[PDB]
Amino acid sequence: KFVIFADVKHFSPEDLTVK
């Protein structure tokens, strides 16, 4: 899903939701 951000949250570097 496209919920991850990269401006303030960033969530995580190596995510497993897309890759």
mmCIF file of N, CA and C in Angstrom:
data_model
loop_
_atom_site.group_PDB
_atom_site.id
_atom_site.type_symbol
_atom_site.label_atom_id
_atom_site.label_comp_id
_atom_site.label_asym_id
_atom_site.label_seq_id
_atom_site.Cartn_x
_atom_site.Cartn_y
_atom_site.Cartn_z
ATOM 1 N N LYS A 1 0.843 -1.224 0.000
ATOM 2 C CA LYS A 1 0.000 0.000 0.000
ATOM 3 C C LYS A 1 0.865 1.255 0.000
ATOM 4 N N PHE A 2 0.297 2.359 -0.478
ATOM 5 C CA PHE A 2 1.016 3.627 -0.531
ATOM 6 C C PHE A 2 0.624 4.523 0.642
ATOM 7 N N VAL A 3 1.148 4.202 1.821
ATOM 8 C CA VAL A 3 0.855 4.970 3.026
ATOM 9 C C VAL A 3 2.132 5.556 3.624
ATOM 10 N N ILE A 4 3.270 4.970 3.264
ATOM 11 C CA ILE A 4 4.562 5.427 3.763
ATOM 12 C C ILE A 4 4.878 6.838 3.274
ATOM 13 N N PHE A 5 5.545 7.617 4.122
ATOM 14 C CA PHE A 5 5.915 8.987 3.780
ATOM 15 C C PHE A 5 7.432 9.154 3.783
ATOM 16 N N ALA A 6 7.891 10.388 3.591
ATOM 17 C CA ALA A 6 9.320 10.675 3.572
ATOM 18 C C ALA A 6 9.590 12.161 3.788
ATOM 19 N N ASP A 7 8.689 12.823 4.505
ATOM 20 C CA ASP A 7 8.833 14.247 4.786
ATOM 21 C C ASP A 7 8.978 14.490 6.282
ATOM 22 N N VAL A 8 8.241 13.718 7.071
ATOM 23 C CA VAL A 8 8.281 13.842 8.523
ATOM 24 C C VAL A 8 8.201 12.473 9.194
ATOM 25 N N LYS A 9 7.249 11.656 8.750
ATOM 26 C CA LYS A 9 7.063 10.321 9.310
ATOM 27 C C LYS A 9 8.167 9.375 8.847
ATOM 28 N N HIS A 10 8.228 9.148 7.534
ATOM 29 C CA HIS A 10 9.233 8.269 6.931
ATOM 30 C C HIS A 10 8.941 6.796 7.223
ATOM 31 N N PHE A 11 8.239 6.537 8.327
ATOM 32 C CA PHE A 11 7.889 5.174 8.723
ATOM 33 C C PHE A 11 9.140 4.332 8.967
ATOM 34 N N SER A 12 9.681 3.749 7.900
ATOM 35 C CA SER A 12 10.878 2.919 8.008
ATOM 36 C C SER A 12 11.655 2.908 6.690
ATOM 37 N N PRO A 13 12.979 2.662 6.744
ATOM 38 C CA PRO A 13 13.820 2.625 5.543
ATOM 39 C C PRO A 13 13.558 1.387 4.690
ATOM 40 N N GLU A 14 13.789 0.213 5.271
ATOM 41 C CA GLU A 14 13.579 -1.046 4.565
ATOM 42 C C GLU A 14 12.211 -1.634 4.897
ATOM 43 N N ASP A 15 11.193 -1.195 4.165
ATOM 44 C CA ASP A 15 9.831 -1.676 4.378
ATOM 45 C C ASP A 15 9.562 -2.936 3.559
ATOM 46 N N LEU A 16 8.564 -3.707 3.984
ATOM 47 C CA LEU A 16 8.201 -4.942 3.295
ATOM 48 C C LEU A 16 6.753 -4.894 2.817
ATOM 49 N N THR A 17 6.229 -3.682 2.657
ATOM 50 C CA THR A 17 4.857 -3.493 2.205
ATOM 51 C C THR A 17 4.790 -3.337 0.690
ATOM 52 N N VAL A 18 5.905 -2.933 0.091
ATOM 53 C CA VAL A 18 5.973 -2.742 -1.353
ATOM 54 C C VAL A 18 7.025 -3.653 -1.979
ATOM 55 N N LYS A 19 8.157 -3.797 -1.296
ATOM 56 C CA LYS A 19 9.243 -4.638 -1.786
ATOM 57 C C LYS A 19 9.555 -5.761 -0.797
#
